[PDB]
Each structure stands twice: as structure tokens, then as C-alpha cells.
Enzyme design. Structure first.
Site, PDB file in Angstrom:
ATOM      1  N   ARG A 113      45.469  39.403  45.808  1.00  0.00           N
ATOM      2  CA  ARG A 113      46.418  39.527  46.907  1.00  0.00           C
ATOM      3  C   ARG A 113      46.517  40.889  47.606  1.00  0.00           C
ATOM      4  O   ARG A 113      47.218  40.985  48.618  1.00  0.00           O
ATOM      5  CB  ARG A 113      47.821  39.092  46.478  1.00  0.00           C
ATOM      6  CG  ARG A 113      48.012  37.592  46.378  1.00  0.00           C
ATOM      7  CD  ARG A 113      49.407  37.376  45.869  1.00  0.00           C
ATOM      8  NE  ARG A 113      49.524  37.547  44.422  1.00  0.00           N
ATOM      9  CZ  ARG A 113      50.677  37.539  43.797  1.00  0.00           C
ATOM     10  NH1 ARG A 113      51.788  37.408  44.522  1.00  0.00           N
ATOM     11  NH2 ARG A 113      50.727  37.647  42.455  1.00  0.00           N
ATOM     12  N   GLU A 166      35.052  33.875  37.496  1.00  0.00           N
ATOM     13  CA  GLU A 166      35.358  32.496  37.878  1.00  0.00           C
ATOM     14  C   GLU A 166      34.097  31.623  37.710  1.00  0.00           C
ATOM     15  O   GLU A 166      34.163  30.486  37.215  1.00  0.00           O
ATOM     16  CB  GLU A 166      35.878  32.404  39.312  1.00  0.00           C
ATOM     17  CG  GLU A 166      37.204  33.125  39.585  1.00  0.00           C
ATOM     18  CD  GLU A 166      37.545  33.071  41.088  1.00  0.00           C
ATOM     19  OE1 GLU A 166      38.075  32.035  41.529  1.00  0.00           O
ATOM     20  OE2 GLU A 166      37.243  34.034  41.837  1.00  0.00           O
ATOM     21  N   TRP A 220      36.572  35.572  48.496  1.00  0.00           N
ATOM     22  CA  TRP A 220      35.306  35.806  47.812  1.00  0.00           C
ATOM     23  C   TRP A 220      35.569  35.819  46.333  1.00  0.00           C
ATOM     24  O   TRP A 220      36.698  36.047  45.895  1.00  0.00           O
ATOM     25  CB  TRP A 220      34.679  37.122  48.223  1.00  0.00           C
ATOM     26  CG  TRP A 220      35.579  38.325  48.057  1.00  0.00           C
ATOM     27  CD1 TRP A 220      35.873  39.045  46.867  1.00  0.00           C
ATOM     28  CD2 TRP A 220      36.339  38.999  49.113  1.00  0.00           C
ATOM     29  NE1 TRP A 220      36.727  40.080  47.127  1.00  0.00           N
ATOM     30  CE2 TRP A 220      37.051  40.109  48.467  1.00  0.00           C
ATOM     31  CE3 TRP A 220      36.488  38.805  50.501  1.00  0.00           C
ATOM     32  CZ2 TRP A 220      37.877  40.967  49.192  1.00  0.00           C
ATOM     33  CZ3 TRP A 220      37.314  39.680  51.211  1.00  0.00           C
ATOM     34  CH2 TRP A 220      37.985  40.736  50.574  1.00  0.00           C
ATOM     35  N   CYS A 264      47.423  34.412  42.250  1.00  0.00           N
ATOM     36  CA  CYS A 264      46.287  35.053  42.904  1.00  0.00           C
ATOM     37  C   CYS A 264      46.195  36.543  42.602  1.00  0.00           C
ATOM     38  O   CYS A 264      47.060  37.316  43.009  1.00  0.00           O
ATOM     39  CB  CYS A 264      46.298  34.845  44.437  1.00  0.00           C
ATOM     40  SG  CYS A 264      44.877  35.638  45.234  1.00  0.00           S
TER      41      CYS A 264
HETATM   42  C1  HEM Z   1      39.784  37.951  48.739  1.00  0.00           C
HETATM   43  C2  HEM Z   1      39.118  37.301  47.781  1.00  0.00           C
HETATM   44  C3  HEM Z   1      39.919  36.664  46.700  1.00  0.00           C
HETATM   45  C4  HEM Z   1      39.811  36.898  45.271  1.00  0.00           C
HETATM   46  C5  HEM Z   1      38.879  37.795  44.502  1.00  0.00           C
HETATM   47  C6  HEM Z   1      40.871  35.976  44.804  1.00  0.00           C
HETATM   48  C7  HEM Z   1      41.098  35.823  43.401  1.00  0.00           C
HETATM   49  C8  HEM Z   1      41.681  34.612  42.831  1.00  0.00           C
HETATM   50  C9  HEM Z   1      41.482  34.200  41.402  1.00  0.00           C
HETATM   51  C10 HEM Z   1      40.617  34.844  40.344  1.00  0.00           C
HETATM   52  C11 HEM Z   1      42.312  32.998  41.230  1.00  0.00           C
HETATM   53  C12 HEM Z   1      42.435  32.151  39.988  1.00  0.00           C
HETATM   54  C13 HEM Z   1      41.635  30.927  40.415  1.00  0.00           C
HETATM   55  C14 HEM Z   1      41.160  30.124  39.236  1.00  0.00           C
HETATM   56  O1  HEM Z   1      41.175  30.629  38.076  1.00  0.00           O
HETATM   57  O2  HEM Z   1      40.800  28.956  39.508  1.00  0.00           O
HETATM   58  C15 HEM Z   1      42.955  32.773  42.535  1.00  0.00           C
HETATM   59  C16 HEM Z   1      43.879  31.692  42.735  1.00  0.00           C
HETATM   60  C17 HEM Z   1      44.596  31.501  43.984  1.00  0.00           C
HETATM   61  N1  HEM Z   1      44.378  32.220  45.093  1.00  0.00           N
HETATM   62 FE1  HEM Z   1      43.241  33.951  45.431  1.00  0.00          FE
HETATM   63  N2  HEM Z   1      41.574  35.233  45.699  1.00  0.00           N
HETATM   64  C18 HEM Z   1      41.025  35.687  46.853  1.00  0.00           C
HETATM   65  C19 HEM Z   1      41.367  35.138  48.171  1.00  0.00           C
HETATM   66  C20 HEM Z   1      42.467  34.217  48.408  1.00  0.00           C
HETATM   67  C21 HEM Z   1      42.916  33.869  49.785  1.00  0.00           C
HETATM   68  C22 HEM Z   1      42.272  34.333  51.082  1.00  0.00           C
HETATM   69  C23 HEM Z   1      44.073  32.967  49.529  1.00  0.00           C
HETATM   70  C24 HEM Z   1      44.924  32.283  50.545  1.00  0.00           C
HETATM   71  C25 HEM Z   1      44.819  32.571  51.836  1.00  0.00           C
HETATM   72  C26 HEM Z   1      44.239  32.832  48.053  1.00  0.00           C
HETATM   73  C27 HEM Z   1      45.299  32.078  47.370  1.00  0.00           C
HETATM   74  C28 HEM Z   1      45.220  31.632  45.978  1.00  0.00           C
HETATM   75  C29 HEM Z   1      45.989  30.466  45.504  1.00  0.00           C
HETATM   76  C30 HEM Z   1      46.988  29.575  46.207  1.00  0.00           C
HETATM   77  C31 HEM Z   1      45.535  30.383  44.109  1.00  0.00           C
HETATM   78  C32 HEM Z   1      45.912  29.409  43.029  1.00  0.00           C
HETATM   79  C33 HEM Z   1      44.978  28.207  43.166  1.00  0.00           C
HETATM   80  C34 HEM Z   1      45.501  27.229  42.148  1.00  0.00           C
HETATM   81  O3  HEM Z   1      46.658  27.410  41.671  1.00  0.00           O
HETATM   82  O4  HEM Z   1      44.725  26.323  41.786  1.00  0.00           O
HETATM   83  N3  HEM Z   1      43.180  33.529  47.351  1.00  0.00           N
HETATM   84  N4  HEM Z   1      42.528  33.693  43.579  1.00  0.00           N
HETATM   85  C1  LIG Z   2      40.530  31.347  47.845  1.00  0.00           C
HETATM   86  C2  LIG Z   2      39.996  31.601  46.447  1.00  0.00           C
HETATM   87  C3  LIG Z   2      39.246  32.720  46.149  1.00  0.00           C
HETATM   88  C4  LIG Z   2      38.743  32.893  44.857  1.00  0.00           C
HETATM   89  N1  LIG Z   2      38.017  33.978  44.535  1.00  0.00           N
HETATM   90  N2  LIG Z   2      38.987  31.986  43.902  1.00  0.00           N
HETATM   91  C5  LIG Z   2      39.724  30.877  44.163  1.00  0.00           C
HETATM   92  C6  LIG Z   2      40.016  29.877  43.052  1.00  0.00           C
HETATM   93  O1  LIG Z   2      39.298  28.651  43.129  1.00  0.00           O
HETATM   94  C7  LIG Z   2      40.250  27.603  43.344  1.00  0.00           C
HETATM   95  C8  LIG Z   2      40.368  26.503  42.289  1.00  0.00           C
HETATM   96  C9  LIG Z   2      40.275  25.154  42.999  1.00  0.00           C
HETATM   97  N3  LIG Z   2      39.252  24.283  42.446  1.00  0.00           N
HETATM   98  O2  LIG Z   2      41.685  26.579  41.733  1.00  0.00           O
HETATM   99  C10 LIG Z   2      41.688  26.536  40.299  1.00  0.00           C
HETATM  100  C11 LIG Z   2      41.925  25.141  39.749  1.00  0.00           C
HETATM  101  C12 LIG Z   2      40.851  24.264  39.538  1.00  0.00           C
HETATM  102  C13 LIG Z   2      41.087  22.981  39.036  1.00  0.00           C
HETATM  103  C14 LIG Z   2      39.933  22.024  38.811  1.00  0.00           C
HETATM  104  C15 LIG Z   2      42.407  22.605  38.745  1.00  0.00           C
HETATM  105  C16 LIG Z   2      43.454  23.512  38.964  1.00  0.00           C
HETATM  106  N4  LIG Z   2      44.739  23.170  38.692  1.00  0.00           N
HETATM  107  N5  LIG Z   2      43.191  24.749  39.455  1.00  0.00           N
HETATM  108  C17 LIG Z   2      40.235  30.676  45.447  1.00  0.00           C
END
Ligand code: HEM
Ligand SMILES: Cc1cc(N)nc(COC[C@H](CN)OCc2cc(C)cc(N)n2)c1
Ligand code: HEM
Ligand SMILES: Cc1cc(N)nc(COC[C@H](CN)OCc2cc(C)cc(N)n2)c1
Ligand SMILES: C[C@H](O)[C@H](O)[C@H]1CNc2nc(N)[nH]c(=O)c2N1
Ligand SMILES: C[C@H](O)[C@H](O)[C@H]1CNc2nc(N)[nH]c(=O)c2N1
Ligand SMILES: [Zn+2]
Lengths: 411, 407
Positions: free
Chosen positions: B109, B283, B278, B106
Site C-alpha cells: 500500500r 506469492e 506487480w 495489502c
Molecule cells: C503495487 C504492487 C503491489 C504489491 C507488491 C501488492 C502486494 C500484495 C500482497 C503480497 C497481497 C497478499 C495477496 C495474497 O497472498 O494472495 C495483496 C493483497 C491485496 N492487495 Fe495488494 N499489492 C500491490 C498492488 C495492489 C493494488 C494496485 C490494489 C488495489 C488497487 C491492491 C489491493 C489488495 C487487496 C484488496 C488484497 C487482498 C486480496 C484478497 O484478500 O484476496 N494491491 N497485495
Molecule cells: C493487485 C495484487 C498485486 C499483488 N502483488 N498480489 C495480489 C494478490 O493476488 C490476489 C489473490 C486472488 N487470487 O488473492 C489471494 C486469494 C486467493 C484465493 C484463491 C483465495 C483468497 N481468499 N485469496 C494482488
């Protein structure tokens, strides 16, 4: 054991058995991944297994494993090691070894080409003047008037580590950088320190933005010596843009021949500390990294200015926009001048084909994702979506410390 | 054992000691880096509880206090007796925030401690889950000025009574295959959409149909609900210079809300814990729009721009990619829906990393995920060495429910 890698775009799944031949270590443990860390005198003792293992691979590749020629060569190397403490590679083995080091280079996107490699055996070389001559011939041969050909030049191997051949330059062709009294930098900031070394060694610096550095060459553990590559051998491309006529007024150019000269070639436990190699550029190496890193030419501001992009907020993506036009310019320029170059779409697409073929024929293809994925437009290239396994095979190219840090000055 | 990480742009070197409290495993060995792979009883519980409570009481400067020892004793009593235990509100809040703090993938963070936690452990039915979720959605959306939130359903017990949200995100568009051979809408959601259809959803068969929620309470069979349309804030996508852009018919939703992950706190497992923040602009604009197996719109956009699509080396993909991303940010801004671009976001993360190194002794970070999917090397994260390790509390992946669920 088998390991599977998946492509998340195509659902193609591959199986890796090759990693079972990996002996060298990664930097990672079950508790920490060091996949983004940039950087994570041998005895007869350790030498003979390394030789044996190499010769077993060489002889398998020729379909002569277990032959009398194979067994005799093992016996011959064994004796040479125990009596002289080292050994000499046959030309066939040097060539094979140099090709395999490239083949094994997990950070190289260009490996589809690994089997086309001109090998120059410079193990008869004795002096820095001799190295200069070898290197000029390499530059000339590789450049080939813009129709670039891959090549490597291999100078004598390490013996006691007090007689090393080294090329002090990080690349055969690079531009000088000069730190000004006011804190600004003229030319390439990446080369300031090496440029200062050159000046101290007696180089007359033109002090411009694109001065080709002199070669600083160390033969046989002696103090290194300066030589100017003949400028007629240094192919350069002025950078212009197909639609933006003011682009040429930026004053940019770059050299055609990327030639790494600071790495160490390991073959069968032998160490070749001077082994300069060259291919051709992928556009982004120049247009993204060389031009647009903040620690390099850093031209993004000036380019976006001339495009009159909105620069008051990063969310206009003014940087991203100028970045793309700069890279179009680099590719256009090289192509207009018939100097070999490859775009990042073509290169990555070739690499995926190479990698699949490698899985079929070889049981794997070690690859470092952090390095393979280009520094712009990452996810619109197929490698972004490709799972990869990174591990270390020999023969190999290794990092080695900078020679000015270790060299014992004779005076 | 004490590990250095260098920023190659700035020469700033930081020392990481936090990894020494790493608990879970990485996928990597000394022989093989798996850094680019997407997915690599009473006895077990008390150690996990102790470790958590130890760090909790440490966070409130009360380590070794009678209150510390007492809770440790009470939780122990409770585990020995009941085989599981219940978190205090304070601990649950701390746990959730730390799971986010520890999310190595993330980039966002820096926000980790501003997280609204909705305690939904009193929930018993899928209707109740629907109610909790609509409230989360409305609270986080906040008429466009988005606020981070997590809603936490009851913890796993024997594993036959799991709560689960079947959707991968609370808000996603449907995906439909056709006799045509092509895909209508979001190709990533085709399978979930069929499960919805087969559970009874009447689909409008459009390009951008907000999927229904499929909620599972107490290990019961999941049920369908439609989020009130008025609570799903969407954004029509236009370009500040190209008037034709709007003709493509592009929109996206404002709330990114991951609903398929498992929250582990103090050894307890919260299988339904939808959380939201947000968007970072890329993304939607890079991945959702331009991925080949997603809406895959590069071809169509490039045409309208009238670029030379004959040769990969004109960089027409790259040009069109930038414009699509300019348009996403511009539409969200114009409609006042919180969005962050990749420059500002990665810059924030670098400052967060420095805070975490200085204040905590490190920051687990997955470079493969942190570096944005466009323009990597012009953002500072590209040049930042990161060490990736797994700390607890954590969000973890978990198997898709339909592969697990006995009906
Ligand atoms: C505040 C706004 C936020 C922004 C801009 C942000 C940004 C991101 C981005 C760019 C990713 C990569 C996701 C992807 O490529 O699919 C991500 C993944 C992640 N975020 Fe954050 N995030 C935010 C809020 C949060 C919150 C509130 C949580 C938990 C309470 C969180 C936990 C995670 C987790 C667990 C992943 C990995 C998801 C996965 O592995 O599929 N995010 N976030
Ligand atoms: C909480 C949050 C905020 C933000 N700005 N972006 C995100 C990321 O979107 C979550 C997305 C879940 N479909 O995680 C990425 C992903 C997608 C898929 C299809 C597979 C995978 N392993 N990982 C989460
Ligand atoms: C044929 C044209 C070639 C292209 C387009 C190519 C492309 C690349 C690129 C883009 C990188 C990453 C460089 C960076 O970002 O700094 C790379 C790294 C590397 N390449 Fe290749 N390459 C080519 C030929 C070769 C040849 C001929 C060899 C050796 C015989 C080789 C061995 C390596 C090694 C060892 C690295 C890693 C260097 C490091 O770790 O700093 N390449 N190459
Ligand atoms: C042979 C070849 C062809 C080609 N297209 N590209 C290359 C790669 O250029 C090598 C590049 C030049 N500095 O080395 C990468 C590097 C840079 C830096 C700053 C540190 C480091 N360890 N490694 C080689
Ligand atoms: C810290 C990080 O690993 C470092 O910046 C790497 C990332 N990926 C790279 N990839 C390539 N091809 N070349 C590089 O110099 C780098 N730098
Ligand atoms: C193969 C590779 O691990 C995979 O494509 C990853 C790469 N980096 C990513 N980074 C982010 N932020 N999100 C992703 O889905 C992915 N996919
Ligand atoms: Zn690793």
C-alpha cells in the site's frame, strides 16, 4: 451455537462448541481485531463461582459429576472460602489444573503432549533457598541427561498479594547480556535489564557471550535472593553444521531446557505467581528467533559472510539462505548430542493431529495462529493453512508484570 | 479508545485513532478472535453517500464549503429521485485510491496514491468489457515496467444487471483433472476451467494455458474472449546457479490482476473492478509453486538438488523453498519485469505504516496476511503489532458468479 473452521489445503472443516465455555475476554471487539497485539487480591465474592466452575470441570473429567464426593467438596471449599477467604487444592486438582492450563494455552504448538506433564507440588516451600532446591530438582528431573521430560513446579498461591512467591528470571536458564559503553551488546540483548538487576544484587558477572544467569528468587513477598544453578545441571549443546566445518568456529551454543518462569498459573480462581514449567525446544525458537532476530544474537551477517553469499542485494535472499543453514545446524547439533528437540515440520504436523482430536473429543482447541505458525517457512507447514479460533479457557497461564516494577523493597 | 501498537524489534510505539472511524464489522468479539478466518435501498444509501462526501471534501480542504453542501444536496436530490447516484470523476478516482489505501491485507500500500483509474462506466456489452480489459492489461504491463491500475465497470443497480469478470484474476493458468487421478496445471482453477470448457472454450490441455476471459455485462450471460497472447507477458523461470532448473519447465505471468472483488465507494457497489499491481516474489515462489494444492513442486526440486528427503529435520523443504524463490526473483529481474522481494516490500510497508500513523492517525493492517509466507520473523512486519479494522471505500469479497447467475 456452532463455529466452523476450515483447512484451505485439505478442505477439512471442523465445528467448535467449546468456545461457549470461554468466559475471559480477547481484546477484540466487533470493530477491532487485536489478534497481533502481544499483550492485549480477589474477594470471596468472585472466588466461589470460579472455584465451583473449576470443581464442576474436575468432577466431570473424572465421571463423578453430581456425586456425593463432588457435592461434599463444593460444600468444603465454600466454607473454607467464607471462613479463611481462600482455599487449598487437593493434589489431584492441582495436577488436573496444571495439565489443563497447558491444554488451554492457545499460543503453544506443543500441546499434543499436554497430558504427560510431571507436576511438582512445592506449596510447602517457605524460603528462597527452598525455592532454589525445588528448582534444581526440576532442572535435573526435566533434563534427564538430554532425554527431556515436561515438568512444572508450583510454589504457594497468592494470598493478600503482599506475600507473593516469584521467580524474577523470565526462564530458569538464560544467558546474560551486557550493554557496553560503546553501545554494542555482549551476550543476549534480551536480558540486559535483568542482568543489571542481578549485578546490582551482587552477582559476579564473568562478562562472556554465553554466561548462564543466576536465579533471582522471591519467597513470601520478601526481597529476592541470588543462587547459581550448579553448572553440572545446566545441559548445553555446542552448535556445529553437518557440512560446514567453519560453523563451529562461530562459537555458538545453547542450553537444552526451555523453562518459562515469569508466568502466572490460574486454577479455580487461585493464583500461582511462581510456577516454572519446561518442555523441549522446537528448532526455530533458537535458530530463527534467538540467533537471528536483529534484537538478539543477530548472526545472519556473519553466517552469510562465511557462506560467501551475495550480500549486495536483499533479492539474492542471502538472509533466507543463511537462516536455513543455521536452523539445520541447531537440529543437527541437538540430535548429534541426543538432546530432545523437534523440527517445525514435525511439530506443526503433530499439532494439526492434536487439534483435530481435540475438536472430536473436546468440541474445540483454542489456538493463536499468529503464534502457532513458525517464524520461518510459514506456508510449507500445515498450520499456515489452518483456520483457528482463539479464546480463553481456565485453568490458564497468564502474563504478569515484571516483579521489579511492582516489588516493595524491604531493604 | 486511543490504541497503542508496539514494534518489538525497535520499541517504536504508535497511537491509532483512525479505528474510531471504523464502520463495518470484523468477525471478532470479546469472547472469540476470528483473526485467522479467511472469510468472516434509499434509506441506507444517503448516510453512506454523506459519510463518503464528507471525507472527500475534507481531503481537498473544502469541508463545510458551499461546494461541499451543494454536492451533498445534489446527491441527496438524486437519491430521493432516482434511488441511486453517480460519482464525479474526481470522487471516483479518490474512492478507488482509498479502497486500496484501506486494504488491510495489502502489504504494497505505500503505492496507494499512484493508481491509474480507468473509468469504464460507459461500458454496455461484454465485447466492450473485453476491449477495456485488454487496454488495462497493455497499459499496466508496459513492456515489463509495471504500473498499478484499476478499471471500473458500471455500478450495481437493481442487482439483476451486475457486471462481472468471472475470472478470479485477469491472467491465470488452466487446471485439468485426469483419469490419471492427478491434476494437470493449476489445481486452484479446475472448476473455472470446466465452466470455460462447458461454455465452449477449446482447451489446449497443457500445464500453463492462459485461461480465456469470461465476461458478464448488464447481468447478461457471460461470454468468452481470449486475451491477445502478445499482451500477456510471461517469464520462463531459471536459477542463477542451478543450470538444471530450466528443465522443470516453470514459467509465470508478470501481471497480478485481481478481478473477482467488489469495490464499494459512498455506498455504491462496483461488482466489476479488475485491479493490478506487480508481484512480491513469494506469492509465486512460495504459494503458487510450493503450496500442496497448487503446482506443489518441492518434491521434484529437492530431488534435483539431491537433498536428504528421508527426514523432515534436514530442512530439505526449506532449502528447496529458498532456491525456488531465488529463481523467481532472478528470472523477473533478468527479463526486466517489475518484481519486489519480501524484504524490500515489508520494509516499505513499515515506512508506509509510519507515514499513515503520522499523517492519518493509523493504518488498518491484517498481520496474518501482511507477514510473508516464508522467513516471517526476519522481515520487520513480524515484530510489528497491527490493528485490523474495516474502513470504507473498500474492496470486499463477493460470491462466485456461477452460484448466483440465473441463465
Ligand atoms: C503495487 C504492487 C503491489 C504489491 C507488491 C501488492 C502486494 C500484495 C500482497 C503480497 C497481497 C497478499 C495477496 C495474497 O497472498 O494472495 C495483496 C493483497 C491485496 N492487495 Fe495488494 N499489492 C500491490 C498492488 C495492489 C493494488 C494496485 C490494489 C488495489 C488497487 C491492491 C489491493 C489488495 C487487496 C484488496 C488484497 C487482498 C486480496 C484478497 O484478500 O484476496 N494491491 N497485495
Ligand atoms: C493487485 C495484487 C498485486 C499483488 N502483488 N498480489 C495480489 C494478490 O493476488 C490476489 C489473490 C486472488 N487470487 O488473492 C489471494 C486469494 C486467493 C484465493 C484463491 C483465495 C483468497 N481468499 N485469496 C494482488
Ligand atoms: C513439550 C515440548 C514443548 C514444545 C516444542 C512447545 C513449543 C512451544 C513454542 C514453539 C511456543 C511459542 C514460544 C515462543 O515463540 O516464544 C510455546 C509457547 C507456550 N507454551 Fe509450549 N511447548 C512445549 C511444552 C510446554 C509445556 C510443558 C507448557 C506448560 C506446561 C507449555 C505452555 C506454553 C505457554 C503458556 C506458551 C506461551 C508463552 C507466551 O505467551 O509467552 N509449553 N510452546
Ligand atoms: C515450556 C516451553 C517449551 C518450548 N519449546 N518453548 C517455550 C516458549 O519459550 C517461551 C518464550 C521465551 N521468552 O516466551 C515468549 C515471549 C517472548 C517475549 C519477548 C515476550 C513474550 N510476551 N513472550 C516454552
Ligand atoms: C507483534 C507480533 O504479534 C509479535 O511479533 C509476535 C508474532 N508471533 C510470534 N510467535 C511466536 N511463537 N513467538 C513470538 O514471540 C511471536 N511474536
Ligand atoms: C488460515 C489462514 O487465515 C490462511 O491460510 C491465510 C493465512 N495468511 C495468508 N496470507 C496471505 N498473504 N495470503 C493468504 O492466502 C493467506 N492465507
Ligand atoms: Zn480478533
Amino acid at each position: 451455537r456452532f463455529l466452523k473452521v476450515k483447512n484451505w489445503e485439505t478442505d477439512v472443516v471442523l465445528t467448535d462448541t467449546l468456545h461457549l465455555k470461554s468466559t475471559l475476554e480477547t481484546g477484540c471487539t466487533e470493530h477491532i481485531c487485536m489478534g497481533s497485539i502481544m499483550l492485549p487480591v480477589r474477594t470471596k465474592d468472585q472466588l466461589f463461582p470460579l472455584a465451583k466452575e473449576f470443581l464442576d470441570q474436575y468432577y466431570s473429567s473424572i465421571k463423578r459429576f453430581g456425586s456425593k464426593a463432588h457435592m461434599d467438596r463444593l460444600e468444603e471449599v465454600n466454607k473454607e472460602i467464607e471462613s479463611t477467604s481462600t482455599y487449598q487444592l487437593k493434589d489431584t486438582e492441582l495436577i488436573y489444573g496444571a495439565k489443563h492450563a497447558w491444554r488451554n494455552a492457545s499460543r503453544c504448538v506443543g500441546r499434543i503432549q499436554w497430558s504427560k506433564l510431571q507436576v511438582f507440588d512445592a506449596r510447602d516451600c517457605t524460603t528462597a533457598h527452598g525455592m532454589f532446591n525445588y528448582i534444581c530438582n526440576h532442572v535435573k528431573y526435566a533434563t534427564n541427561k538430554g532425554n527431556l521430560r515436561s515438568a512444572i513446579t508450583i510454589f504457594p498461591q497468592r494470598t493478600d498479594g503482599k506475600h507473593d512467591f516469584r521467580v524474577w528470571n523470565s526462564q530458569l536458564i538464560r544467558y546474560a547480556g551486557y550493554k557496553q559503553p560503546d553501545g554494542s551488546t555482549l551476550g543476549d540483548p534480551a536480558n540486559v535489564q535483568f542482568t543489571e538487576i542481578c549485578i546490582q544484587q551482587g552477582w559476579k558477572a564473568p562478562r562472556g557471550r554465553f554466561d548462564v544467569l543466576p536465579l533471582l528468587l522471591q519467597a513470601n513477598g520478601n526481597d529476592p535472593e541470588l543462587f547459581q544453578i550448579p553448572p553440572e545441571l545446566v545441559l548445553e549443546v555446542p552448535i556445529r553444521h553437518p557440512k560446514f566445518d567453519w560453523f563451529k568456529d562461530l562459537g555458538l551454543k545453547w542450553y537444552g531446557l526451555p523453562a518459562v518462569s515469569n508466568m502466572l498459573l490460574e486454577i479455580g480462581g487461585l493464583e500461582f505467581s511462581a510456577c516454572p514449567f519446561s518442555g523441549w525446544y522446537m528448532g526455530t525458537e533458537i535458530g530463527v528467533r534467538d540467533y537471528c532476530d536483529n534484537s538478539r544474537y543477530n548472526i545472519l551477517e556473519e553466517v552469510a559472510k562465511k557462506m560467501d553469499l551475495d550480500m549486495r542485494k536483499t533479492s539474492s535472499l542471502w538472509k533466507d539462505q543463511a537462516l536455513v543453514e543455521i536452523n539445520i545446524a541447531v537440529l543437527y547439533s541437538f540430535q548429534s548430542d541426543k538432546v530432545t528437540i523437534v523440527d517445525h515440520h514435525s511439530a506443526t504436523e503433530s499439532f494439526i493431529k492434536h487439534m483435530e482430536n481435540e475438536y472430536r473429543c473436546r468440541g474445540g482447541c483454542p489456538a493463536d495462529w499468529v503464534w502457532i505458525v513458525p517464524p520461518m517457512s510459514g506456508s510449507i507447514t500445515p498450520v499456515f493453512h489452518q483456520e483457528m479460533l482463539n479464546y480463553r479457557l481456565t485453568p490458564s497461564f497468564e502474563y504478569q508484570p515484571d516483579p521489579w516494577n511492582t516489588h516493595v523493597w524491604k531493604g
